Design a protein around this ligand. Structure first.
Ligand code: WHP
Length: 185
């Protein structure tokens, strides 16, 4: 791909984070804590899952960023509507306002309803995410494999401002403590 020139500097929004997340001082890294991180509750926080949003809101244009997923066993990445549900149980789908891919139990899948199997020959250590608001496109790229395409959601019905979306995943196994990191431009 040649989308690199639409690079945007994403930072994480502490106020949206699940209460067990630890966001770095620079707001560019997030990981699972081993307990509640001693914050007040609020209506923005994802309650059921280890999720957080970027601070940036996008309603037009072309945007690109990259995320480091090195040595994680489970995560979700993409974009979502600013108005997505925060509390209780929900599935990641375009009907619920999410355009995402994930790693879970040694397979990669796109968050369609029902989910779509991804075909990745080189397990990625860094993921590129491209959003074209006007075109209704969200695309995912394998930076480890020379930028190869992972998945394109097209005919997207955003229906509102978009936010970068992250899930560090559970760490029941003791093998998923590593952070998500926003990679430098
Ligand atoms: C299960 C728990 N911690 S962990 C490290 O994954 O065992 C958790 C932490 C944050 C949100 C939901 C849940 Cl369920």
């Amino acid at each position: 791909h040649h989308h690199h020139h639409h690079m945007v500097h994403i930072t994480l929004d502490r106020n949206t984070a699940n209460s067990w997340l630890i966001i770095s001082k620079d707001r560019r890294q997030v990981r699972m804590g081993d307990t509640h991180q001693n914050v007040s509750d609020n209506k923005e926080r994802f309650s059921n899952y280890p999720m957080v949003l970027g601070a940036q809101r996008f309603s037009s244009g072309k945007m690109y960023w990259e995320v480091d997923v090195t040595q994680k066993e489970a995560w979700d990445l993409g974009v979502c509507r600013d108005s997505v549900q925060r509390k209780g149980q929900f599935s990641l789908s375009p009907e619920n306002g999410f355009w995402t891919i994930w790693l879970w139990q040694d397979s990669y899948e796109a968050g369609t309803s029902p989910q779509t199997t991804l075909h990745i020959q080189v397990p990625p250590c860094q993921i590129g995410i491209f959003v074209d608001y006007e075109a209704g496109v969200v695309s995912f790229y394998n930076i480890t494999d020379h930028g190869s395409l992972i998945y394109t959601f097209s005919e997207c019905v955003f229906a509102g401002p978009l936010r970068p979306f992250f899930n560090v995943g559970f760490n029941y196994s003791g093998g998923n403590a590593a952070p998500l990191k926003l990679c430098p431009l």
